[PDB]
Amino acid sequence: TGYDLSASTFSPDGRVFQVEYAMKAVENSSTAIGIRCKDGVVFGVEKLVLSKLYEEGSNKRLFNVDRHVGMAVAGLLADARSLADIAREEASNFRSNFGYNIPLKHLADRVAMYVHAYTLYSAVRPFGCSFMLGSYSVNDGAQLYMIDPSGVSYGYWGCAIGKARQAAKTEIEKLQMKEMTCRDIVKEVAKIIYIVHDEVKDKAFELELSWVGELTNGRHEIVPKDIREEAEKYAKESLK
Amino acid sequence: SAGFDRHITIFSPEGRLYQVEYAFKAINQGGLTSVAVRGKDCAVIVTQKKVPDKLLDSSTVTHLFKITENIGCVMTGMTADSRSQVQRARYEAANWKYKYGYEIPVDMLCKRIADISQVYTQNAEMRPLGCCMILIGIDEEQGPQVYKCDPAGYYCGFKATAAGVKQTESTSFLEKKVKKKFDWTFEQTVETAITCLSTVLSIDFKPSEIEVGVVTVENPKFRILTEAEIDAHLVALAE
């Protein structure tokens, strides 16, 4: 109280409270897990359909930052969409001024700097959405970076953002992402997401998958519906 | 007294700026410790490398950032603000090179960094960057140099130093060590830095928990010691 009304006021013990509040806000949303294959990066987000009137694909949380970069925002959807727009702008500017696809590391660093610049001013508030960036390139392998409201962003072999981040990590650490390919890893992602789901507190959800790697010629595209069901079939096979 | 600690540009009754001290304290939020030791012909810095998750990528967590091939930095404190300051330092070094030719000396580099921080603290527009910036680098005519220059805007010349949660203990250990004049050799400097960190943290210092960076007169280029070199230095330290 008193030191937590603005993002530019350091707490007496040395902690910017608004950033922690944004982290809590992102913690208040659904789970989104990114798992790095041996030859790609797979994104999976549990997209809760708040009402039956939605169009099975509305407000999807999987965004294509660029051709090779996939983003798996989870949290305040408006902030996530704004961040996706800024990431696309940065990717376009990097390609125009340098001529080659912006490396996932550099794009993540620039977007993280942009996010952190919004937790330093009193006239702006920290982004309430945490996002993970994924891409594949033979030149630089598959990279999966997660940037939260605080602005910190280091690479991950596999990360989960949302309500059941800890539950997702418990059953993701039990997966060998070092060697597996992006074919069975999709089924693993579907199963892990289905495990981390209340199903009594959340009425229903529409699993949406995504991947980028060698199997997709290096580009990031929505997982084909033909094989997406196979992942859904495996998840259903898993009892939870 | 306590009602003046909500804005950075308001002076306390006794003549203090409370927000700058608050940022100094926030420096410790990362829970890490970093130490720099300036040898006779070398400058070595060692910082903790905490990876409290099996899914993290240990290669992307390193806190030792290379501002330039000849100048080095280790950010301690808040990660995001530390990375922002590292990017600003890289920009400052590049601009100095572009405008004056010769590489900007480390002292000048983060003197510019500290001036930026101070201008931040004077005009109440942005929260001060809560991240201590420890610089190293061989300077012609002045031997190895390590400069710590902090949020409030203070930069000084250091024979040895440290920033982080365990700063007072590490500095006391260095003072106990720095006083017995002896051959400050590369191996000796690295050993003393690692020993100070181990005693302050009271840890066995597994090779994957530390990250070291050394700049030497013979090789005046920032080099991040790999796991093998760190392990060899540790085994030499033990015996």
Added chain:
Amino acid sequence: EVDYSATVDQRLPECAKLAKEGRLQEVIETLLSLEKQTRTASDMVSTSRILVAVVKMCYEAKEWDLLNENIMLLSKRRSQLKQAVAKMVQQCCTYVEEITDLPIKLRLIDTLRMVTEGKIYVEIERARLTKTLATI
């Protein structure tokens, strides 16, 4: 954690026979490498076994100077497991009274006190060694 104890049981008497042959040295190197591997592998039981066996071989062979060097080397080893060093110091202090020559006993007591100085686990062993030194 790998539990090299089974391997140590077989590799101990083999090297012990060569050590009792008299050449030693190479036995010292082999046991040193085995101890390094075991300690890096968290082999408390086998590490203690190897330490005690090597100290026993050094003492039995009468390599007094070698005994001192090896005692110090194994005591100052990287991340040396506490229990193994404790048992090694216990064996050394059990041998100290056996050795009768005043100079050799004094030197061994000095090395044992140096190794155990500032250690809580071998604190009572240090007290006993200090009492023995005071008596001598």
Added chain:
Amino acid sequence: TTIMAVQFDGGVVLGADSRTTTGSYIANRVTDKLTPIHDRIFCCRSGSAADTQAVADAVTYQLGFHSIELNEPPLVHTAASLFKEMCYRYREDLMAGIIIAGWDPQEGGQVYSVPMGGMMVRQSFAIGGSGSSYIYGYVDATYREGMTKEECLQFTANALALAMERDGSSGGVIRLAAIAESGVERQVLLGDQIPKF
């Protein structure tokens, strides 16, 4: 001037004249048209000296900043992009053609030609400057594939040598540089070393 580059397997060899004439007078006879833009990248300056020099430093700061930020050696195409943007934006005022050659661990040794007008294209060999309209025929009849370092130098030495004699704006001494994975070697041919006829 006469700046030429030719890429071989595992590296690239580039060379340029050492003549810089202010109208009808040679102000400098020891000019260097082989500008090091990075550890393993160079740019050849042709056209207005001030425009060539200033754009050289400008590209260095951007690439040098970029190289440090990515902690990975810059791609030659990265050098090509910056020159094209800088020249095209300033083309109506900037008169200078930059031929940039270098090696990267991404694809190998490449040479990119940016003639006056912000034209960016990658080719095995490229000759620019006023003297380029003199060795065009002789260089074409000598170009081949698979040249080694020794073969490349003999090509570059003669190619520039032919134009130097046939052109009046290029002269002085021969500058060459070999850029590859191992490193960069800068050799200067003066006096007898330059082939004659």
Added chain:
Amino acid sequence: ERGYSFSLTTFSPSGKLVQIEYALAAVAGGAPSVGIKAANGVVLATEKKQKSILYDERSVHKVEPITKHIGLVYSGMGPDYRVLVHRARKLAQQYYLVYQEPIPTAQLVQRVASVMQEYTQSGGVRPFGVSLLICGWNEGRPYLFQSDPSGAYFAWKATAMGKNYVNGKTFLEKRYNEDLELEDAIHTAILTLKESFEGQMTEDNIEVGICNEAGFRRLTPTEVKDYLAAIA
């Protein structure tokens, strides 16, 4: 009147710019500094103590030159002093360029005071928490001025700022004679630092600068050692 001790752009009922007084207190709570003006030259001395033996005493200098014949010593917040010195150097060089004559001490001091006052007129900008003490030798007459965060400048003959400034001022008016010389002025300044100096005065802990007709120059540790040994 606790309600008006916050903003620098509002007047208290009694008519006190509270923030300026608080900044002056912060200045008086800094490192000691004493300067004496002699008929031949001026002397500036500040105590340079680092919190531990781990600090390079030579890396940061409290006494810095503004031009060939102007000096600067401070007592308070050093980071603010760095910007103050940068502005002073810029002002001196601007005056030199416009007039091609080294900026007189009076004019440089006045412009530095104007720079200081520039920050005490708008909310959101903290007054400079350092009071500068300027040396000088222009027109063959030694000068000594003090510029404060309030913007006011005076012509101190000899004064001590920072911690224990009352004791320094009391020491002055006792050992100060208007007809001294540079060496005697240096000795008096060293003694004045001593009476407000905690611990041994090592060569690396006290930094002094003579600013006579020859110009301003920071005495190297050797000369400071010689002077302290002579006094000691």
Added chain:
Amino acid sequence: NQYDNDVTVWSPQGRIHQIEYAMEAVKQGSATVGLKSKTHAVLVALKRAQSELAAHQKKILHVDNHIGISIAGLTADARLLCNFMRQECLDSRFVFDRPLPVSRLVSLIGSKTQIPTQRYGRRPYGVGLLIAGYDDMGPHIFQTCPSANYFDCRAMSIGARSQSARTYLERHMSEFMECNLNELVKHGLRALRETLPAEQDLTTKNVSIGIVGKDLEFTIYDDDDVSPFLEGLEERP
């Protein structure tokens, strides 16, 4: 509490309360139903008259030939968003000579609304827009709540007493796809009529109908024009 004044202050629980209040701003307006069949996107809105002898307030606005909206919220923000969408549609026509996609316009609206919810200086756009349009992918019925989040809905309904319309649309979602213009309009009118209290009835003076189809440009039916659709509606039980 004290975190209830600005959009740039984060509540301890993790909510920007000002955004919640902007969202609540929708319910102060009249109920509006928007629904789409295979070829048509019809949205029916209820018009409220300030006085008995005052023209009923316009609720269905015209944006472009293929993009219609219903405003359920602040008149100020509703009109501002309508003007911005009109400008975007005109720019798309001028530069591309092609109808600006409804999805892209909705995304632009969301992006523009997000900024007021992230930077101090102006309140969030307290208007809920039901965007109906026809493009290459068929009819689109979006809802752009003040929270800067838009949902692509088959048949949405915002405004006061809108829950009944939403429930009816959920019940009859199946028939919406394979229905003609008349049946779609009648279902929308039934959804609106469910929202009204028992006494009030769907009269020709307080219903506005907007339709965009395969070959039919946007049309706003008011007063008698609604009569052909209104007649034949089953009397409410």
Added chain:
Amino acid sequence: TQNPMVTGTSVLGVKFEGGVVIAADMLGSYGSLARFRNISRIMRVNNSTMLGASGDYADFQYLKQVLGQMVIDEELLGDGHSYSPRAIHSWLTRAMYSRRSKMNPLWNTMVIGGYADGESFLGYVDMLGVAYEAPSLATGYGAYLAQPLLREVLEKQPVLSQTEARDLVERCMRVLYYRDARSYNRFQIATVTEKGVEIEGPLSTE
């Protein structure tokens, strides 16, 4: 762009039932000299549209980056909508007309042709902004030499075949080689049909 430095030859394109075909030379002639001879003057924008232009290749190259990012953004949204050949044409017309109004126009006479929803599109926006729809278009000289020929084939028979289109341009660029001082005997052919956009080449002549 006030004094072109590297320019281009003519660009030819004739529309047939089922798609459209375009071709262009690969000779970048700075002034009268063949500065470059391996450049591509016809690159695709999307699966159902392709373009190629004359004039300053640098100016056109700038257009390549703009369209690529401008085109790439199209699929990033993943909404299904893609810039129709008219859509790109309309953007181009305002793109250059806006640039010309500020005395810095792109000295790059473009031609954009594509196949969309069963109809072919062949537009040409000149270096200044003029644009129209014709069954067959040729830039620069091609209007003088190849363009007159294409009316004769279209006037008597406005319907053509892919092979009839293939040689027609060949008989079009062949005459370009004979009576032109800036042509080159290495050209690409761009075919756009339901199967997509394909670029192949070069090709020579007797």
